[PDB]
């Protein structure tokens, strides 16, 4: 296969076998340690972080009886998320998003999940996610996660991811609010570049979230026999959530469009202003310079000596020329 992961910092393998009586915890790095839990009939959860270690992830993927196509989809990072259906297993890819201040661009990390028989696999490209709340919920016997099957864990991970999307949406909402307020107060270049990057980020967020609602609708309507019917409505709930998310993105995009177009078509008007500022001063002052070069003549004879009060005359001439040249304008708003 091929490797295209951006990060090579760290690798980690974690296992989680839950039951109505006891849960199993095991922190390690050896790939072999997870072989026995695969044979267990109880539902299991596997976490692998770090796509740089291609050998171990390939061995795991081909050890569970998964088609190479799913494996190369896992290795592939630059593609739109979309769910894969099969007669035995299902495979799902998502682009979990995170945002930060001091620099306005979306941060996408690919997260892959596989549900086969009674086993859930999940692969993260980079260290750092928001999948813990369900972890400490199941760890402390909270909720009813233990009683239900692996589909509960699958859509719990999905709903946690869309909750992270909710958080990122509220951060972006703050972004539009502050950008619009600053633009209304003072439209300047920096806010305009912020508008550019916000528009690009909104387009990317749209491109990532639009497939999500279709994916959730597919998992709702298709209902493959692998997933138990008892969890059928719950997925729909997540779908509803995604719908909300999709909606807000659209609105936000509309807003930034309104924050862009009015700034564009008026730029030519700006040029006119510059025109006028470069013209009137060139209209009034340039002849004066010429005048300053004439009555400051340096011939052998000075005709100005014959003239009486010559400088009051020349200063008055320059002043009245300036006045007539400045009242030549502004008659139809050049200032």
């Amino acid at each position, epitope marked *: 296969l091929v490797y295209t992961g951006k990060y090579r910092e760290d690798f980690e393998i974690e296992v989680m076998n839950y039951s109505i009586e006891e849960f199993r915890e095991f922190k390690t790095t050896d790939v072999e340690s997870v072989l026995p839990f695969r044979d267990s009939s109880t539902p299991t959860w596997i976490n692998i972080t770090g796509i740089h270690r291609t050998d171990v992830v390939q061995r795991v993927g081909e050890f569970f009886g998964i088609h190479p196509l799913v494996l190369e989809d896992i290795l592939n990072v630059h593609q739109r998320p979309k769910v894969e259906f099969f007669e035995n297993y299902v495979f799902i890819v998502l682009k979990m998003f995170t945002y930060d201040k001091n620099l306005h661009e979306l941060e996408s990390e690919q997260v892959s999940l596989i549900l086969t028989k009674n086993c859930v696999l999940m692969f993260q490209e980079k260290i750092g996610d928001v999948f813990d709340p369900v972890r400490e919920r199941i760890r402390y016997n909270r909720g009813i996660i233990r009683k239900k099957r692996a589909d509960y864990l699958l859509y719990s991970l999905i709903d946690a991811l869309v909750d992270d999307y*909710f958080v990122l949406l*509220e951060k972006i*909402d703050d972004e539009i609010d*502050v950008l619009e307020e600053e633009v209304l107060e003072r439209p300047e270049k920096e806010t305009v570049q912020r508008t550019h990057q916000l528009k690009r980020n909104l387009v990317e967020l749209r491109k990532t979230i639009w497939p999500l609602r279709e994916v959730l609708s597919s998992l709702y309507r298709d209902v493959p026999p692998l997933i138990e019917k008892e969890t059928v409505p719950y997925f729909r709930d997540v779908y509803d959530h995604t719908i*909300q998310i999709a909606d*807000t993105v659209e*609105t936000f995009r509309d807003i930034v469009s309104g924050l862009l177009d009015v700034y564009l078509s008026s730029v030519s008007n700006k040029t006119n202003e510059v025109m006028k500022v470069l013209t009137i001063i060139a209209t009034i002052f340039m002849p004066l310079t010429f005048i300053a070069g004439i009555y400051g003549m340096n011939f052998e004879y000075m005709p100005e000596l014959r003239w009486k009060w010559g400088y009051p005359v020349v200063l008055a001439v320059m002043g009245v020329i300036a006045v007539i040249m400045v009242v030549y304008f502004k008659k139809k708003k050049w200032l």
Partner: antibody
Amino acid sequence: EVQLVESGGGLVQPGGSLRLSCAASGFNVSYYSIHWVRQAPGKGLEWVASISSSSGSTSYADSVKGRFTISADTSKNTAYLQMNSLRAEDTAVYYCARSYWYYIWSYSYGNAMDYWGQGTLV
Amino acid sequence: DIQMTQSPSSLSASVGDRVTITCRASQSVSSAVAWYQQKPGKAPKLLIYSASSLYSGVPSRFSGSRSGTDFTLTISSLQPEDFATYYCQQSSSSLITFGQGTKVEIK
């Protein structure tokens, strides 16, 4: 016509348990949300409890989570708020509030408390 | 767990003056905040929810605004019945937290 009533207050001996009763008139408890908010004498207000009977979901304040139990029913248009493990810092005024949801964006929905009550000492 | 700070602790002004009370949010809250007044020995009164939408029946001279993550409750002109305590609340989630409470004082 619409107004909100409170009851169940009074002097409390430390270490005891007491139940506050919230009556309603002009409106029903089921349709809207009912909150309980505590204000210390001269200090800031604190939302202590929430209830929404129609949906059935119930949420409690973090600083009180586990101490109190809140519920309501439309049989008598009543809201019950039982409290145990009381202490002297709870010496404040407790208020009933009628709250309705409102829409700001398609993803996050706000909340507001329009009608309150005179409250009782706790 | 989102808290909500308010400034100043208290303010003093006379009738016919514009006063601004600011509300800072340590964590992000989308737009869900509310502004309340509390006359002594009286139930709190809702004034402005969503930081830009006014309740029905409140004086028209009231207003509010939202800048970035921060919030502002401003009054163009005080009233003799308006000197009171003001309160800032956020309702981003089911866990809702109030503000410190600013006291309006006469000069």
